[PDB]
Design a protein around this ligand. Structure first.
Ligand code: RIP
Length: 292
């Protein structure tokens, strides 16, 4: 057997709880001990985890980086120590240092949502000369933040009726998104929609919109997390999200670490995992964190 370290960006995100626990469970099912290390969105805490993990002689690391550039020195240190690293959900801007990186096709998720954003909103406001909107960005040091925003804009920018009047990071965080949205609503009451880089931000934005009596603002998220599935299902003002498949990601990452540890050496360096569009029209095909 042996032991696997599961190092996660933060556990203050329902989606990362699922990702981390699927990995831990899969490691255990394959006969490893496994420990989850919560970095709390802090690259310094992540580095302390990597020190401790190296000292404890862990056999493999399942890694979700706080910073696509800054987390590289942690990976390098594990590698020097002979500990293979498998990235899950976020990648690093390197190569060779991770055996494999498995994460979603986040650009394509952005494109899927940009399309539905345009479609849903032109349908609600066919004659409007401007449809003003706001974007909540994820954590700026996370690859998915930009992949999703870039992909979204690749579509929505082609439709100049849509005017992005505010753009700000809410750190992939619900309470942060609440405060940020509360400030955005004061400064730009004309917005008719909010596109958010993850579901936690969608939920914070919704709470803020509801508090101001602004239940007319259509909110668009990303992840397929429990309370966003629920919101969409209950007919609330979050009308869509992009389903990711953390259970698949986590499972592959652990299985490959096991396979690596008995000599398997051909894994691809980058594996994109597909995503799907969730709407009011198809919500019944989905549950929290996956299909059914
Ligand atoms: O893919 C994940 C999820 O969107 C999470 O909610 C924030 O971190 C991203 O890397």
């Amino acid at each position: 057997k042996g032991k696997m370290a599961i190092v996660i960006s933060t556990l203050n995100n329902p989606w990362f709880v699922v990702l981390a626990e699927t990995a831990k469970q899969r490691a255990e099912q394959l006969g490893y001990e496994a420990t989850i290390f919560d970095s709390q969105n802090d690259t310094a805490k992540e580095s302390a985890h990597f020190d401790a993990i190296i000292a404890a002689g862990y056999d493999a690391i399942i890694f979700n980086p706080t910073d696509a550039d800054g987390s590289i020195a942690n990976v390098k240190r594990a590698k020097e120590a002979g500990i293979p690293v498998f990235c899950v959900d976020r990648g690093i801007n390197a190569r060779g240092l991770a055996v494999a990186q498995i994460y979603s096709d986040n650009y394509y998720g952005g494109v899927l949502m940009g399309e539905y954003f345009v479609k849903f909103l032109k349908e609600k406001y066919p004659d409007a000369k401007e449809i003003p909107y706001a974007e909540l960005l994820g954590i700026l040091s996370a690859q998915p933040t930009w992949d999703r925003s870039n992909g979204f804009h690749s579509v929505v920018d082609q439709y100049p009726e849509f005017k992005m009047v505010a753009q700000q990071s809410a750190e992939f965080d619900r309470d942060t998104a609440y405060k940020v949205t509360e400030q955005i609503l004061q400064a730009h009451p004309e917005i008719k929609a909010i596109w958010c880089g993850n579901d936690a931000m969608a939920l914070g934005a919704m709470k803020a919109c509801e508090a101001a009596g602004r239940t007319d603002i259509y909110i668009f998220g990303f992840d397929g997390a429990e309370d966003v599935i629920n919101a969409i299902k209950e007919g609330k003002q979050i009308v869509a999200t992009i389903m990711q498949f953390p259970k698949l990601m986590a499972r592959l990452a652990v299985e490959w670490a096991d396979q690596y540890l008995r000599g398997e050496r051909s894994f691809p360096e980058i594996v994109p995992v597909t995503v799907e569009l969730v709407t009011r029209e198809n919500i019944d095909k989905y549950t929290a964190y996956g299909r059914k």
